[PDB]
Ligand binder design. Structure first.
Ligand SMILES: [Cl-]
Lengths: 89, 89, 89
């Protein structure tokens, strides 16, 4: 009875966490496409100056997309919630 | 006794998760305002070329703000922690 | 027996959540460095116009980096998982 309740409490919290993680990654994917397009525009505008980084006289900053990691963790979390929901039923 | 302990363990973890989710969304909100201002500047600098996208000769990337989703999930999580803390007291 | 199982269920979920939080913050750190470099390039390109914000005729958008907050919450979560794993063994 207490195992049933706590398992349901954990699943309800984790469902909300998994939805938030997906949404945070979705916004990062959305924002990064705008940022990378902005960089491409800056590289063309400063082409004669060797692009953005040479124009500023700095080391280049590159974006490291790690979306597949968060996608995989969310899939594992959702599998665990589903396995626990089935154990109950 | 074990139900009391596990309920407290879950609430402590979830409080920390909810704080992190809020903070990740806050940083995304903060970063997106800088990115959108950067895009507006690029659109003005390339106005004669039809703006950023026509200047690059690409399909436009737009940002999809989904802050309200994460805000809502965090509010539900915090309500669930509070309901459980009250059940204990 | 039920306390052992639920404690293991919570640790498995939270390990995955903590990994996702770190990864979301890592991508935000990575993206912000590209965005801030983009802003520096725009400030130099619009120097005669007083920089990006004066060029657009807008209030300046600044990025509020809160990485240390998420790093700290992840460290506390991982400490809690480890304390619980030890309580079991
Ligand atoms: Cl940008």
């Amino acid at each position: 009875q207490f195992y049933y309740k706590l398992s349901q409490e954990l699943n309800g919290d984790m469902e909300r966490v998994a939805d938030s993680l997906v949404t945070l990654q979705d916004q990062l994917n959305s924002l990064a496409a705008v940022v990378l397009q902005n960089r491409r525009a800056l590289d063309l505008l400063t082409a004669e100056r060797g692009g953005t980084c040479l124009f500023l006289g700095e080391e280049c900053c590159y974006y490291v997309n790690q979306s597949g990691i968060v996608t995989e963790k969310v899939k594992e979390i959702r599998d665990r919630i589903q396995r626990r929901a089935e154990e109950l039923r």
